[PDB]
């Protein structure tokens, strides 16, 4: 469990690194969505016990988006967050940091995003992606009326929640539930996380084209909540990656976050998956 620190051309990211190496595996690299960090995006997964027995025979670099680690300084007024791309831009640094060279990318929401833009700029040190609720393109001109409409309604959390979890989740009120609308609401770190918020909405595309000269060269698996917020963005990007590396894993009952209520399932996924690009697992 080593924390550490690097510098890019966008300011500092943190990372957390788990196991000892395996010098001829990828890295398993996650990043995570907006209102989150390592810590409540990905580390119920990682600690799952099956996940556990997988991952025995990778190192593990898990990235706290900047000003999203436990603890961060709340950046200064006009403070100037990095885009998307610029995130993805930071990547080879932690990688060089460490000196790992391919990875196997776990991302959620803008956490997946990036991880793609990350692929596309860098192809050959990328083995594989897990995308869970990818939405690859821009937001549309009706997406922002719609989005600048709800804004009038709901404060910023209330937004970030309607990100991460459906609105079905929302009213339902699980423990879960309670407990995130508690960690997004009363962040102290709320200002730092809207900006990654607005880095996220203002995304360019990434245009997958099918067979064109911008897509994805790994397997890639696809995940998303049946009628959850973000199925019909990952719907639509399947139909644009190659079938022949791509599969999509749509859950039935798990909502926003497939990977805090369905890690059993997830896991068990990403066993094939990993399977599914030659590694016995």
């Known amino acids: 469990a080593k924390t550490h620190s690097v510098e890019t051309p966008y300011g500092s990211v943190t990372f957390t690194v788990y196991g000892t190496p395996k010098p001829k595996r990828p890295a398993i690299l996650t990043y995570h969505d907006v209102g989150l960090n390592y810590k409540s995006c990905f580390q119920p997964l990682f600690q799952f016990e099956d996940m ?15 000003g999203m680690e436990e603890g961060a300084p709340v950046f200064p007024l006009g403070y100037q967050y990095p885009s998307l791309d610029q995130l993805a831009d ?44 990818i939405d690859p393109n821009a937001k549309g001109w009706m997406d922002w009326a719609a989005h600048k409409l709800t804004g009038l309604t709901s404060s910023i959390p209330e937004m970030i929640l309607g990100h991460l979890f459906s609105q079905e989740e929302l009213s339902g009120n699980s423990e879960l539930i309670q407990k995130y ?7 102290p770190n709320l200002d730092n996380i809207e900006n990654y918020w607005n880095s996220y909405n203002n995304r360019r595309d990434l245009n997958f084209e099918r067979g064109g000269d911008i897509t994805l060269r790994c397997p890639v698996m696809l995940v998303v909540g049946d009628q959850a917020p973000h199925e ?31 890690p059993g399932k997830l896991t068990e996924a990403f066993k094939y998956f990993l399977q599914g690009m030659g590694y016995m697992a």
Request: hydrophobic share 40%; proline share 5%; aromatic share 6%.
């Open 232 to 262: 019909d963005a990952v719907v639509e990007c399947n139909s644009k990656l190659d079938p022949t590396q791509t599969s999509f894993l749509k859950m039935a009952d798990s909502g926003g976050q497939p990977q805090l209520t369905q």
């Open 52 to 66: 556990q027995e997988i991952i025995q025979n990778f190192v593990r670099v898990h990235v706290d988006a900047p």
């Open 90 to 133: 930071m990547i080879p640094c932690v990688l060089q940091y460490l000196n790992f060279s391919t990875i196997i990318g776990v991302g959620v929401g803008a956490g997946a995003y990036i991880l793609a833009r990350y692929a596309l700029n860098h192809p050959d040190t990328v083995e594989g992606l897990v995308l869970i609720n």
């Open 181 to 187: 609308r508690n960690i997004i609401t009363h962040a």
